[PDB]
Design a protein around this ligand. Structure first.
Ligand SMILES: Nc1ncnc2c1ncn2[C@@H]1O[C@H](COP(=O)(O)OP(=O)(O)OP(=O)(O)O)[C@@H](O)[C@H]1O
Ligand SMILES: [Mg+2]
Length: 247
């Protein structure tokens, strides 16, 4: 019932940030304390594990506006992040491989969280990874998408991470990601309520704590975890074969 709240970031370096995630996920052993990580990324585009960089983004537009190109451990679509986006991930013990339940429980915690801020949201309905919005892995505010999520599961452990749009540049996001309006399909938490990043963070902290019945206490990353992260970074996340999609 005791948990770890990690306010671990790496702005300026999206690739190292993703490395931390896989690091806390891979070092984790069945029975450890649940982990809740909050973090942000500066202007960058993150694609899923099975994606092909040159199939969702124009490497040129990103070379022009200084958008970092990073690829994550989990599948799913391509997203645009900037400091207006509040990313967070949960790592806990797992006794099965049921993906549907993880997303259902996590989305439940997020809904309870935004309620606290007076924002009534709901999870998407469709079971289609290809469609941009209204997926069961998304959280909707009315008809607009405000949060996207992906995850992975292995024997004894599961990972779930999300990206919520608090005050992100919805135009820019639309411009960088190819789909085929999108702009008209997403929205920021602040379109509904005037709240800061921390307020949304503190809201989610209570939400996940109350929903999951886990007392998350601010903690720091461990040497073991930090080492593995540097490891994952140096040998994968900081390489082109991985970020392009060849590794
Ligand atoms: N920072 C963001 N947070 C939430 N949704 C976003 C963000 N940036 C863009 N989007 C919208 O969310 C979509 C994310 O891709 P997709 O719908 O395939 O799954 P996802 O699970 O939300 O991806 P993530 O898990 O967001 O990489 C984009 O195509 C876009 O329409
Ligand atoms: Mg999603």
């Amino acid at each position: 019932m005791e948990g770890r709240l990690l306010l671990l970031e790496t702005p300026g370096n999206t690739r190292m940030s993703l490395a931390y995630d896989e690091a806390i996920y891979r070092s984790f052993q069945y029975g450890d304390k649940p982990i809740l990580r909050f973090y942000r990324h500066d202007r960058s585009v993150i694609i899923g594990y099975f994606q092909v960089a040159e199939e969702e983004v124009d490497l040129d537009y990103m070379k022009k506006n200084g958008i970092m190109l990073a690829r994550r451990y989990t599948g799913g679509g391509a997203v645009y992040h900037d400091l207006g986006d509040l990313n967070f991930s949960v790592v806990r013990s797992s006794d099965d491989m049921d993906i549907t339940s993880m997303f259902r429980t996590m989305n439940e915690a997020v809904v309870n969280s935004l309620r606290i801020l007076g924002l009534d949201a709901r999870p998407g309905e469709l079971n289609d990874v290809s469609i941009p919005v209204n997926k069961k892995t998304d959280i909707m505010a009315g008809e607009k998408k405000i949060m996207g999520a992906a995850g992975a599961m292995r024997k004894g452990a599961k990972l779930w991470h999300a990206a919520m749009l608090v005050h992100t540049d919805l135009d820019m996001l639309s411009a960088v990601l190819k789909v085929p309006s999108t702009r008209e399909r997403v929205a920021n938490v602040t379109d509904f309520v005037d709240v800061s990043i921390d307020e949304v963070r503190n809201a989610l902290i209570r939400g996940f704590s109350e929903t999951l019945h886990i007392d998350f206490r601010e903690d720091t990353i461990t040497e073991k975890e930090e080492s593995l992260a540097r490891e994952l970074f140096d040998k994968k996340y900081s390489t082109e074969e991985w970020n392009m999609g060849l590794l």
